[PDB]
Amino acid sequence: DSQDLLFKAESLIVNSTNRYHVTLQIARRAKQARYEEMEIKPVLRAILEMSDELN
Amino acid sequence: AKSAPIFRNRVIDKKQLKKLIGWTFAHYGTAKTAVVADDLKALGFR
Amino acid sequence: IPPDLRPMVQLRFATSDLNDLYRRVINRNNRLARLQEILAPEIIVRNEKRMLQEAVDALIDNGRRGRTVVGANNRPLKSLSDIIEGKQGRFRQNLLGKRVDYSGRSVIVVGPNLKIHQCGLP
Numbered sequence: 679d680s681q682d683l684l685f686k687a688e689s690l691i692v693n694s695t696n697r698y699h700v701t702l703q704i705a706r707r708a709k710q711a712r713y714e715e716m717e718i719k720p721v722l723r724a725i726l727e728m729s730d731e732l733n
Numbered sequence: 734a735k736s737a738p739i740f741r742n743r744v745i746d747k748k749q750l751k752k753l754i755g756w757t758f759a760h761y762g763t764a765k766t767a768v769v770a771d772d773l774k775a776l777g778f779r
Numbered sequence: 780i781p782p783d784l785r786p787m788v789q790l791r792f793a794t795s796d797l798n799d800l801y802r803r804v805i806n807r808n809n810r811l812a813r814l815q816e817i818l819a820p821e822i823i824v825r826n827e828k829r830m831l832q833e834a835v836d837a838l839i840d841n842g843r844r845g846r847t848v849v850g851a852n853n854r855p856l857k858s859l860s861d862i863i864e865g866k867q868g869r870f871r872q873n874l875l876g877k878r879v880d881y882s883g884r885s886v887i888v889v890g891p892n893l894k895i896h897q898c899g900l901p
Contacts, residue, residue, distance in 0.1 A: 767896070
């Protein structure tokens with residue numbers, strides 16, 4: 679849900695110590711995602727993946 | 734998290750709401766503060 | 780200046796003020812060359828040189844030194860300096876702020892059932 683994405687976003691903004699750096703990482707990840715998927719929306723999948731990787 | 738809310742047994746003006754929102758942000762984060770603000774908005778409108 | 784930066788488009792023909800200022804400069808320069816070719820009286824040549832100086836002045840910055848060159852209507856012609864200065868100048872109207880694509884505008888009403896991270900778009 680939207681709330682879930684908002685919580686995962688907040689979760690990633692913390693523990694990163696740089697909102698800009700983590701926004702850049704999310705952008706890059708989502709770009710690669712869509713690129714290797716054209717072969718859900720990229721930024722969303724990127725955030726889901728990065729949240730699930732933070733354990 | 735882990736901070737249990739206090740039972741505010743008093744009248745609630747704007748100052749109390751602002752204080753509660755600040756406390757919620759300080760203890761719970763920015764998306765629980767958003768949730769609390771939406772819930773308070775719904776309760777007040779009703 | 781390149782002609783597309785002083786466009787002469789057809790609606791009638793709408794022309795930039797630079798065309799008129801440049802025409803004044805060219806006319807006075809050609810007349811001065813003719814006067815220098817026929818050995819005109821010195822006062823006439825000197826007055827033409829003064830006129831050329833004034834025309835170039837009005838081109839670079841209209842109204843800075845002498846009288847202001849008005850147009851067909853009694854309004855100052857926009858010279859080169861007037862393009863890059865002021866709130867309507869190039870820097871503040873087109874470089875520091877622009878009209879952008881993928882934009883809309885509409886009246887706002889209150890949506891009480893929306894969430895804080897949502898908006899209602901028609």
